Design an enzyme around this catalytic site. Structure first.
Site, PDB file in Angstrom:
ATOM      1  N   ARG A 155       7.097  -0.213  -9.127  1.00 16.30           N
ATOM      2  CA  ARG A 155       7.480   1.157  -9.197  1.00 16.30           C
ATOM      3  C   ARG A 155       8.375   1.428 -10.315  1.00 16.30           C
ATOM      4  O   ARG A 155       9.836   1.298 -10.415  1.00 16.30           O
ATOM      5  CB  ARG A 155       8.095   1.540  -7.581  1.00 16.30           C
ATOM      6  N   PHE A 168      13.220   7.434 -15.875  1.00 16.66           N
ATOM      7  CA  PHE A 168      13.785   7.298 -14.293  1.00 16.66           C
ATOM      8  C   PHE A 168      14.598   6.727 -14.359  1.00 16.66           C
ATOM      9  O   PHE A 168      15.959   6.066 -13.883  1.00 16.66           O
ATOM     10  CB  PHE A 168      12.638   7.914 -13.612  1.00 16.66           C
ATOM     11  N   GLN A 188      12.332  -0.070 -10.378  1.00 21.54           N
ATOM     12  CA  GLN A 188      12.451  -0.057  -8.720  1.00 21.54           C
ATOM     13  C   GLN A 188      11.849  -1.705  -8.528  1.00 21.54           C
ATOM     14  O   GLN A 188      11.071  -2.016  -8.844  1.00 21.54           O
ATOM     15  CB  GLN A 188      11.641   0.613  -8.290  1.00 21.54           C
ATOM     16  N   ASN A 191      16.251   3.533  -0.706  1.00 22.29           N
ATOM     17  CA  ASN A 191      15.652   3.650   1.421  1.00 22.29           C
ATOM     18  C   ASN A 191      14.527   4.581   1.191  1.00 22.29           C
ATOM     19  O   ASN A 191      14.035   5.138   0.389  1.00 22.29           O
ATOM     20  CB  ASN A 191      17.118   3.727   1.728  1.00 22.29           C
ATOM     21  N   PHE A 199      16.782  -0.641  -7.334  1.00 23.19           N
ATOM     22  CA  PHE A 199      16.609   0.102  -8.498  1.00 23.19           C
ATOM     23  C   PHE A 199      17.539   0.177  -9.443  1.00 23.19           C
ATOM     24  O   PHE A 199      18.898   0.214  -9.481  1.00 23.19           O
ATOM     25  CB  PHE A 199      15.857   1.464  -8.327  1.00 23.19           C
ATOM     26  N   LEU A 202      20.575  11.544  -6.576  1.00 26.30           N
ATOM     27  CA  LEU A 202      20.239  10.955  -5.956  1.00 26.30           C
ATOM     28  C   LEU A 202      21.920   9.965  -5.300  1.00 26.30           C
ATOM     29  O   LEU A 202      22.400   9.908  -4.376  1.00 26.30           O
ATOM     30  CB  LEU A 202      19.610   9.589  -6.735  1.00 26.30           C
ATOM     31  N   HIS A 243      21.892   7.193  -2.334  1.00 32.03           N
ATOM     32  CA  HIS A 243      21.340   6.081  -2.374  1.00 32.03           C
ATOM     33  C   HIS A 243      22.610   5.594  -3.032  1.00 32.03           C
ATOM     34  O   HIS A 243      23.771   6.442  -3.766  1.00 32.03           O
ATOM     35  CB  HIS A 243      20.363   5.794  -4.146  1.00 32.03           C
TER      36      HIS A 243
END
Length: 164
Positions: free
Chosen positions: A54, A59, A62, A101, A112, A121, A125
């Protein structure tokens, strides 16, 4: 000192190079140790051969689902999931290494690497390291993502381990 680990990454079967990560074991020892051991494979499982599944340009990239290769799987060295250790380190900019998560206290193996500051985040995270070398490789990976997260090349961690 803090561990240095590496990921060697292919795209469509050809090497992009190496990402070197410093793991902040002084701040998040349990989270750092999980990632370190998954890089060496010393528990009998880990990141070798798995994918960046991903990737969203502007951004993050991942990876870490070495069981289902799609965002649903992974496991830690402690058991399937482990708690959020702390939120002391922040998502300050490109190169931050953080745990993916599925809500509070669901860390496993997915992680990531940010390509921008992701302040929303923070507190959600667990940040546990950053890129020491190989941001060029991260930018290549990022360029093979899409808005949906689907990758346009197959991005594989061919080798990984501990440098110090």
């Amino acid at each position: 000192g803090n561990p240095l680990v590496y990921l060697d990454v292919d795209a469509n079967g050809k090497p992009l190079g190496r990402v070197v990560l410093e793991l902040k074991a002084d701040v998040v020892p349990k989270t750092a140790e999980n990632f370190r051991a998954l890089c060496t494979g010393e528990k009998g499982f880990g990141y070798k051969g798995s994918t960046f599944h991903r990737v969203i340009p502007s951004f993050m990239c991942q990876a870490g689902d070495f069981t289902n290769h799609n965002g649903t799987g992974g496991k830690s060295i402690y058991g399937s999931r482990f708690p959020d250790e702390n939120f002391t380190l922040k998502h300050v900019g490109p190169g931050v290494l953080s745990m993916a998560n599925a809500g509070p206290n669901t860390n496993g193996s997915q992680f990531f690497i940010c390509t921008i500051k992701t302040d929303w985040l923070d507190g959600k995270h667990v940040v546990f390291g950053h890129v020491i070398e190989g941001m060029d490789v991260v930018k290549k990976i990022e360029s093979f993502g899409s808005k949906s997260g689907r990758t346009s090349k197959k991005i594989v961690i061919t080798d990984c381990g501990q440098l110090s």
